[PDB]
Design a protein around this ligand. Structure first.
Ligand SMILES: CC(=O)N[C@@H]1[C@@H](O)[C@H](O)[C@@H](CO)O[C@@H]1O
Ligand SMILES: CC(=O)N[C@@H]1[C@@H](O)[C@H](O)[C@@H](CO)O[C@@H]1O
Ligand SMILES: [Mg+2]
Ligand SMILES: [Mg+2]
Ligand SMILES: [Mg+2]
Ligand SMILES: [Mg+2]
Ligand SMILES: [Mg+2]
Ligand SMILES: [Mg+2]
Ligand SMILES: [Mg+2]
Ligand SMILES: [Mg+2]
Lengths: 741, 740
């Protein structure tokens, strides 16, 4: 096979480019920032807001800008001096002294939340320090100040990662300003004329870079892949005031030091700013796409970098007329972020690892992550196909890693074989599952992300929900509390999942104190709905003394918040042999120890029924302390260490399930899959197209008269598939393998 | 020396009673041996043991507001069973006091009280019929119930399988007829009890919250709880005095029943004041009567002790001769010992003389000595006057090793008293525990059921257990104290500990800038602040700061609002004064050193150790604590978060500890924390034991010190004296040594 593969080229590397193009079956080449001779489709990456220092050096007040929050400084008398730049990278960020600081900045008493009157502070003429007087001693104070971004965040990251030393730093520019906007469009018009051979303009990306701010030690300081920090200017702020009827505070951006993280329950000012920016971004993206098209070229957008304000999952994205979106793939969730976008002709995955020396260094084996990423993306692709794949970075760097080079040959062949055999259509999905949160559709597959593709200690127990779902045999949608409150719950939905910690966009915050939301979900489950809550689902703090999870009644579990310690909690015996946990292997010795130690007997002020030893066997990630069964009719499936990890509760005709956390693994995907079939009273439907081995999965393509079976592990796996007729069929899959039937 | 010892006795056991009295140096006997020359204690139970009275005045039993289970409405009607979740042998809905006046039906989904016109109480079953309500909401009734079985007598019946034995019905002296009966009966009992020297009141008028469920298990307990203290009469009177009307909700408290862990509300404090005035007047009368009859009056610190408030000003005005209480551990010893307003104090030690521990094959002396050692370390810091045991002497007599053990304990209790003159050891630092309650709950923080710390509490209770026998002076202060008067200038260290939104951390008081100013200024001037768990926490006040004093202690807790900000952890300092006595684990240290620290990665911060150093039991985790800057000293920061840290703050210091279960090592850890945080490292060595399993008590007046072995194993230790000289000791099992 050949094709559906983009190769990155490099100058003075003609022979090996040609050799790798042949080896990997490349049908497009993405040129550096014999490619003509190969006669493949040509992509040129285009950088609308950088790569022209000779422009922006003449117009330095037109760089993009950001509100920055200083460290908190303690007043030891009725005065404080606050250094502006001590905690920031001075090669990236410069305080804006041009735009009246008393109009644009804010000094805040963080101990009280009060804005300090601008009459009480002065900016030092000679150093980046604000002097404050007439304030309370023993409070903490900060400045929120406008800063110019004098180094493109991503180009800077590239420089630092590659140790480019004294190579000139690229200064970014902001097309909000008419001079720069005219420059960008004029320059693009000429580039088009000067680039007759380019087939695809790969905009990498457009106008506003996601929040990416570095510190005084040259480390990342603040990151949010969705963040709008790097999008302000005196002019845009003043224009916003005229258009929206109110003036944004610096606080509306720095957000008490949260910088409007996507995890924060979204505020109207955030939504308004997104609306303001997107109208402007989309208008200008449309013009770039129209120019590309008139020049006989395709317009392709990278899902990342300067993608702020594009909103690929908001209505109207299709009207931009972008031909394609290409995105970074490191797993199934990030695959689906790209694959599910409706408004384009085709999609492309640029697989991790990027060809940079942070991964490609002597002693490291990149083929391991390479194939791990593929296994995770592969299951997602079977559920929602992407048209094309490829890689990025220095081809000469990857070329020196023969094992990885072989791994890419394997992946590329298998990608093509999957497309060829499936005809590029999605596998048949078996249940309709809706993730409910504050954002809904606009953040499809985007819940729980902070840095793209990089879940961490704080997030992985929830990101694992999406990762499991990304390659699972169900149909997944993303809905918001606004949707549910305006329209109820759609009659085709089988299961609603609500997951995350308390007081976030993902659980929903005080929306759970809205009686109409509680009524809607309760009535729907009672009628045969299924509600799966993960971590602190439906949580609303200090609304009811005795109830933290507002839907504790549904899922059978609440979290003790140290207000109800007088109330003895009684745990019913765990049911170790249950549909949901059927695929969990428990060590015989572990199960014996659990059986032998028994359950706590009631003791004053200590409740009773908790297992003295754990049953274990499931990685539930981060604990939720002191979860407990609300009554003895809930079924406990895991309740180790004196609290609950896993429970199911009958609620009228439907069911609630509680999961304390769910990091991704093949086994946990199976656990969640059993949860969805069980909670919706569809246990009967599970058998058809199931894999006996928990670490393998099946994808059924009725149209092609076909099914495949994938091994989700780097180990050999034997498995038995059950067809819809009842008959079984056996497989012996090698490491990371696939078979078709 | 003889005496300071109370012996239990029983019918037909005169011979052995005299023998053991002589062997143990007993000077008191409790329940024909009435004719021995000993002080005679008789228990008195003012609110029970008189079913002949109360069965003719059943509207005068004590009452309690009860909260039903939450019932889901699936239409505009809902029926709420009143009694399905409660023990019907203990509790009965009050049908005499107009339910529409005294009860509340609540929509828990909205918090609104359902109007009287929308509900009725079924005439024939204990069910409330609600109509005109919203489908898919949860509803509850808060109803008055008579308590028809004394809760402690009930507990003993259930625990000891007393079967068909008559249930004792309790009664409430708030009603004048019952009150008059209680006093007339006592007047007559005193007349009829000439050989009684000490009336052991067990206890007085109101039982601590103790409610059982339909399965005969405990449902709700609070050793401090005021639930079982209401009546229509008392509720109306409170309104008369305080000028506002209490709701049933002021008692049920959303299902929390006013747990001492709840940040206290004005209505709770007003109720305590209301109740305590009544209880106190009536206790004084009982004590006055005892005294007029030539008897002493002794209060049990427990059971019906609600409203006595032994740590509140004016307790001394009662004229109680003594408090006796249950010795469960060091903390519970201090609860008794520190009470200032009585003439003497008495501990009832373990084991109780009962077949549950006194059975063939068991060795009760182990528990006996465990109990003594736990109490003894506290007694050196705050002496108690007397010891003793309870239960069946005939059972203890059958265990000769146990008898020999008690002989030793009693002799040692008296020896300590004699050598020290009943004076507290010198304290080396002044430590104040700061919470919502302060002095009125001295040694009482973190308790739910007496002497029964559990998963949710032990990480904080260990603070008190550590301090209970520690060589420092401990006081309990409130936020109200600090706001009114500032921080007393003799205090060296303040400790604030507990989870967020509890009386122990303080709740929204930490958003009051005067509190923050006062504490910060005081630390900056050389004070020491030790915060444990979620100290100074205030939820949703500042987006970027959860612990309001994170700047002092150098640690905050990530609340998933600030995930965009990379957290950078400085390298841990494994060799430090604070952790100098933590047992080293060479293999753990080796693997930790070898694995190194995480390098910065986007969205993941950096600097966290890849493997844990470990070595310290911090109890329950506080997830995602992080250092606020890189100048904080991390002492333990395993598993991507912080357990132990110290931060300089002007002249003073802050220390963060995520949790502190009691142990010898952890009490040493806390002790080193106190000396270090107060810049008193140079003062640490004076009057100290090198071995953490031993403790030192200095009596500068008596020109004396002792060193005690807190374990049942031999312990060598070196004691350092004020002048820098040292002395080595080889302490036997449970031993003690005295020196000049
Ligand atoms: C898909 C996307 O936006 N990728 C960017 C990448 O370009 C950038 O170099 C990196 C910096 O940390 O962050 C993200 O991974
Ligand atoms: C000191 C005190 O009040 N002790 C009581 C005890 O009398 C009672 O039997 C028990 C019931 O659970 O509770 C407490 O332990
Ligand atoms: Mg910093
Ligand atoms: Mg061509
Ligand atoms: Mg509250
Ligand atoms: Mg119950
Ligand atoms: Mg019935
Ligand atoms: Mg009256
Ligand atoms: Mg908020
Ligand atoms: Mg070891």
């Amino acid at each position: 096979s050949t094709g559906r593969f983009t190769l990155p080229s490099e100058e003075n590397f003609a022979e090996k480019t040609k050799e790798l193009a042949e080896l990997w079956g490349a049908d497009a080449i993405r040129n550096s920032d014999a490619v003509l001779a190969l006669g493949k489709k040509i992509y040129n990456a285009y950088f609308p807001t950088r790569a022209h220092n000779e422009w922006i050096t003449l117009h330095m007040d037109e760089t993009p800008q950001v509100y920055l929050l200083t460290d908190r400084i303690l007043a030891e008398s009725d005065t404080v001096d606050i250094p502006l730049m001590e905690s920031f990278f001075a090669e990236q960020l410069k305080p804006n002294r041009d735009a009246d600081p008393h109009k644009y900045w804010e000094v805040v008493d963080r101990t009280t939340g009060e804005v300090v009157d601008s009459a009480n502070w002065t900016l030092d003429a000679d150093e980046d320090t604000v002097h404050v007087s007439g304030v309370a001693a023993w409070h903490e104070y900060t400045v929120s100040f406008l800063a110019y971004i004098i180094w493109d965040p991503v180009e800077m990251y590239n420089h630092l990662t590659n140790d480019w030393g004294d190579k000139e730093h690229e200064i970014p520019f902001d097309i909000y300003h008419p001079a720069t906007r005219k420059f960008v469009f004029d320059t693009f018009e000429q580039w088009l004329k000067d680039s007759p051979q380019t087939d695809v303009v790969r905009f990498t990306t457009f106008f506003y870079q996601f929040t990416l701010l570095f510190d005084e030690k040259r480390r990342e300081k603040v990151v949010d892949w969705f963040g709008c920090a790097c999008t302000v200017s005196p002019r845009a702020l003043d224009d916003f005031e005229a258009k929206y009827g109110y003036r944004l505070r610096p606080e509306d951006f720095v957000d008490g030091g949260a910088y409007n993280s996507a995890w924060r329950v979204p505020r109207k000012a955030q939504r308004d700013w997104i609306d303001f920016l997107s109208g402007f971004v989309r208008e200008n993206v449309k013009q770039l796409a129209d120019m590309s098209h008139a020049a006989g070229k395709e317009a392709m957008m990278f899902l990342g970098d300067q993608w702020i304000g594009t909103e690929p999952y908001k209505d109207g994205f299709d009207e931009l007329g972008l031909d394609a979106v290409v995105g970074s793939i490191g797993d199934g969730t990030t695959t689906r972020m790209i694959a599910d976008i409706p408004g384009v002709k085709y999609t492309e995955g640029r697989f991790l690892p990027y060809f940079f020396p942070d991964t490609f260094y002597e002693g490291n084996d990149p083929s391991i992550e390479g194939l791990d990423n593929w296994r995770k993306a592969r299951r997602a692709i079977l559920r929602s196909p992407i048209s094309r794949m490829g890689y990025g970075g220095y081809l000469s760097l990857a070329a020196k890693f023969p094992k990885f080079v072989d791994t890419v040959t394997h992946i590329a062949n298998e990608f093509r074989d999957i497309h060829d055999r499936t005809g590029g259509v999605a596998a048949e999905g078996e249940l309709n599952v809706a993730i409910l949160n504050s954002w809904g559709k606009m953040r499809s597959w985007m819940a729980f992300t902070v840095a793209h593709a990089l879940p961490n200690k704080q997030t992985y127990s929830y990101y694992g929900i999406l990762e499991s779902l990304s390659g699972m045999r169900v149909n997944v949608r993303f809905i918001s509390f606004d949707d549910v409150l305006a329209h109820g719950i759609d009659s085709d939905i089988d299961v609603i999942i609500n997951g995350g910690p308390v007081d976030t966009a993902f659980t929903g915050g005080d929306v759970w104190t809205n009686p109409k939301l509680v009524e809607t979900v309760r009535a729907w489950v009672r009628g045969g709905g299924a509600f799966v809550g993960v971590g602190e689902p439906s949580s609303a703090p200090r609304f009811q003394t005795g109830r933290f999870f507002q839907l504790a009644d549904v899922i059978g579990v609440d979290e003790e918040r140290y207000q109800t310690l007088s109330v003895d909690k009684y745990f019913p015996p765990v049911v170790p042999d249950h549909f949901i946990t059927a695929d969990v292997p428990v060590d015989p010795a572990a199960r014996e120890a659990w059986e032998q130690a028994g359950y706590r007997i009631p003791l004053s002020g200590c409740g009773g029924g908790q297992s003295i030893k754990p049953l274990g066997g499931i990685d539930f990630g981060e604990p939720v302390l002191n979860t407990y069964p609300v009554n003895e009719n809930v079924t406990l499936l895991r309740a180790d260490g004196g609290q609950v990890q896993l429970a199911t509760n009958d609620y009228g005709k439907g069911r609630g399930v509680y999961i304390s956390g769910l990091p991704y693994s093949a086994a946990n995907a199976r656990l969640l899959e059993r949860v969805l079939f069980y909670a919706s009273h569809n246990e009967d439907k599970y058998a058809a197209w199931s894999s006996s081995n928990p670490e393998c999965e099946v994808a059924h393509f009725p149209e092609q008269g076909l099914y495949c079976v994938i091994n989700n592990t780097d180990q050999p796996q034997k498995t038995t598939v059950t067809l819809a007729d009842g008959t079984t069929e056996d497989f012996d899959l090698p490491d990371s393998g696939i078979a078709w039937r």
